[PDB]
Each structure stands twice: as C-alpha cells, then as structure tokens.
Amino acid sequence: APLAHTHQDFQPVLHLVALNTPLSGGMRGIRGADFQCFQQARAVGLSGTFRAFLSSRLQDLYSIVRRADRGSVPIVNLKDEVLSPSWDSLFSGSQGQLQPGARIFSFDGRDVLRHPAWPQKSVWHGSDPSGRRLMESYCETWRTETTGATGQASSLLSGRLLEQKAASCHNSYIVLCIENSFM
C-alpha cells in the first residue's frame, strides 16, 4: 500500500504534492478537488491542511496559503526536496519556474513526469502569472469537462507551474495540492 511520509520537523516547509490520478475540468467544483487533496494526504499520514492548486470563484490561487507563510517558507516535494524558496516566488513573474532537475511526486510516491498514469504532462491552475483567477478560463469553477469551455493550464516539461495555455476542459491533467500553512 502507499508508504507514509513522516516529515522530520526542523524548519517550516509547505509540501506541494500531486493527486494520484489526473482529473478533467469536471472536478465537482473546488470542494470536489480540495476533498481529494485532503483524503490522499491523510492516507500517507500527513497532518497539514491541503488544498487544490487552483483558482476558484472569488478565490485567487495566490491567497490559498496563509499570509504569514507566503514570503519565506520553502516549498518542497513529498521527499522534502525544494521546489521553490517560497510561495511568493512562484508569482514573481517567473511563471512558477521550478528548480532545474526538480520533480513532483503524487501522494502515493510516483513521479508524475515519468509515470504513464499521467498521459498529459500538463497541470491545471485557472490563474494568471500573478496567481489571480481567470473567470473566463477555469472550467466554470471546475464544474465541467465539456470541450467548449477552457481552463488555464501549464506544460510541466517547461519547468514552470504558471504557463498560460487555455485548454479544453475535456482533458485529463495533473492537479497539485498545496499545504496552506505550516503546523
């Protein structure tokens, strides 16, 4: 079964972990995506609060992490490898540029880029490079997988989380979960 991640606490960090399955724009709303993050996190023994890395109605992706934890707290993957020095650095205009060589793991320990369970190496986000929501491009608040509606997404092969591609909601992409505060 999935092995648990037991974080040796030292200094505050926030984990960025991918869901175990890709999802389409029809996620049953943000409530739907957040619940899967919460469930999969607990399954590997994490105690923090995980929320989907997505913008929603009246909610900018940028304000997902608690104010106090935004400017300094390092972002690390499941294996506690650093992806970013802080939350704010992703919204610096770098388009969420990750550390060269970095890798994103699912809650169950798989490298999303290397594993075939994720056919499409793209991440949904519904936001601009500032982390502001795109009301015209977030699959109607992640409630539809119809070909006609779009959701802003990013190619992971690029190394950046916030690239600006408007993709058809009828697509199976990677969805990330971010620990919203350190405790």
The C-alpha atoms of residue 27 and residue 121 are separated, in whole angstroms, by: 18
The C-alpha atoms of residue 145 and residue 76 are separated, in whole angstroms, by: 30
Q: In this chain, which of 39, 42, 45, 80 binds Zn ion, going by CB under 5 A?
A: 80
- Output 1 or 58, the one with its CB closest to Zn ion: 1
Positions in 112-131 near Zn ion (CB under 5 A): none
Give SS3 for 61. Answer: helix
Question: Can residue 58 be called a binding residue for Zn ion (CB under 5 A)?
Answer: no
- Output 2 or 26, the one with its CB closest to Zn ion: 2
Q: What is the DSSP string of 96-158?
A: SBPPTT---BBTTS-BTTT-TT-SS-EEE--B-TTS-B-TTSBHHHHB---TTSEEEEEEGGG
Question: Can residue 7 be called a binding residue for Zn ion (CB under 5 A)?
Answer: yes
Work out how close the CB of 80 gets to Zn ion at its nearest, in angstroms, rounded to a whole number. Answer: 4
Work out how close the CB of 20 gets to Zn ion at its nearest, in angstroms, rounded to a whole number. Answer: 13
Interacting residues with Zn ion (CB under 5 A): 1, 7, 80
The annotation places the binding site for Zn(2+) at 5, 7, 9, 15, 80
